[model samples]
Target: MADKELKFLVVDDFSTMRRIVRNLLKELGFNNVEEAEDGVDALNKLQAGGYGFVISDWDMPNMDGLELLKTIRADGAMSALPVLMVTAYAKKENIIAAAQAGASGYVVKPFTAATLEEKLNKIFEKLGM
Candidate 1:
């Protein structure tokens, strides 16, 4: 199980989507979750520090998830931060691009709770968290 106190940032353009992700995490016993309307907001929160993980959508207004991922990877402080792209873009190219940009994991939209849990655990295990 994930650490219940580790903070999570859920980024999506739609409030409903963010709420859904937040609730799912809540159900999994993770209560310390926050939401951002887009990548810009997400980045702002991330840059402020104290974020343990990020779950971001691919498409957004100011900055897209790919850009956010790249930025996080490039930043010295957050370079090793575990980023999980939870997006509807399931194309081969999209997956490849995200992987190339250094995403810790990718989950297609409409994913089940089990899948999210599995991916989170996989990332944690890989990081020895």
Candidate 2:
């Protein structure tokens, strides 16, 4: 699977959460993964280039996911990038806002590997990648 080589950005304020998602992505055969503490850090890393996908937490220090979404959308270089909001904010409003703001998918926290795979596959399928 080319997905194995696709570079992914795992963004979360907590080291534990970043590790968990990074490990999970490894299990899914995506070995090329990077991490950032929050949206601001993520944007910095993202601006440096080479990320194919982003899995981020919503609530964070320095810039939240929505702000990140807006920033990503505003940036011409990164506007087409695929972004997934993997967060604990599971409210319907939050999900809708994420979708409207250009998140490729929204997965609430406590999701399983299967759920992660599902969301990843959905994005991949939509992108035909």
Candidate 3:
């Protein structure tokens, strides 16, 4: 029940991974997407509004996914926004880091179209979308 018209922000450092997430979302019928190569870029884009979701990684060099979530959690307008960590940071340490930062969901790295679809589905269902 996710909003197909909802805008998405795909955050990653790698060009290929960002595009891959874009393509996977496209396959799931979500084309209203944007890309951010840095956590700074993602934060800058978030200020523009109309964003509905975020799929990001924890290994950002300039800034990290953990800091991003913490910032969002402290922000006013979109403080409750849904942030899904979809990265290769599968380590227990990193997982706790993101989780403690108030992550909305997690989609381990190397996800396929189907895996993404189901994950999105679960989030939407939980959020009553």
lDDT of 3 by residue, 59-105 (tens): 88888888888887888988878889877747888778888888878
lDDT of 1 at 21: 90
Ranked candidates, highest TM-score first: 2, 1, 3
* lDDT of the candidates, in the order given: 0.89, 0.89, 0.87
Cα error, residue 81 of model 1, in Å, equals 0.9
TM-scores, each model vs. reference: 0.94, 0.95, 0.94
For model 2, which pairs clash?
none
lDDT by residue for model 1 over 22-60, one digit each (tens)?
888888888899889887788889988999999999989
How many angstroms is residue 68 displaced in model 2 relative to the true structure, after the best TM-score fit?
A: 0.6
Model 1: residues with Cα > 4 Å off, grouped in runs: none
Model 2 score (lDDT): 0.89
Candidate 1 global CA lDDT score: 0.89
List where candidate 2 sits over 4 angstroms from the true fold.
Answer: none
Identify the superior model by TM-score, candidate 1 or candidate 3.
1
lDDT of 2 by residue, 5-72 (tens): 99999999999999999888888889899999988889999989988999989999889989998899
